[PDB]
């Protein structure tokens, strides 16, 4: 039981880290999508000016 719990702790740690990079990647996706909206719309602004 001791070593089985140790192994379960290993797997839970690995899943925790995996969810960590998952959240990091989702946050980076959010930020990049938000910043990417800073584009051709304003060029069309002058296009219509």
């Amino acid at each position: 039981q001791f070593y089985k719990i140790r192994d379960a702790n290993m797997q839970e740690l690995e899943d925790i880290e995996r969810h960590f990079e998952q959240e990091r990647s989702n946050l980076l996706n959010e930020f990049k999508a938000k910043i990417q909206a800073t584009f051709k719309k304003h060029l069309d602004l002058e296009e219509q000016y």
Binding site: Q1, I5, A8, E12, I16, H19, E23, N26, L27
Partner: protein, 49 residues
């Protein structure tokens, strides 16, 4: 901000508490009932002798 992204700490700590409690149940399912029978024999023979 994504509410789920920003709260890794509490959710993981909940997972950890659940793992701790589930392990406690598993390890506790098979110990300490021997002492009950030993002491009950002790006291039965006490009232007997």
């Amino acid at each position: 901000m994504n509410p789920s992204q920003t709260q890794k700490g509490k959710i993981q700590i909940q997972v950890s508490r659940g793992s701790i409690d589930l392990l406690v149940r598993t390890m506790y399912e098979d110990i300490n009932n021997i002492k009950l029978k030993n002491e009950r024999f002790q006291k039965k023979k006490r009232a007997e002798d």
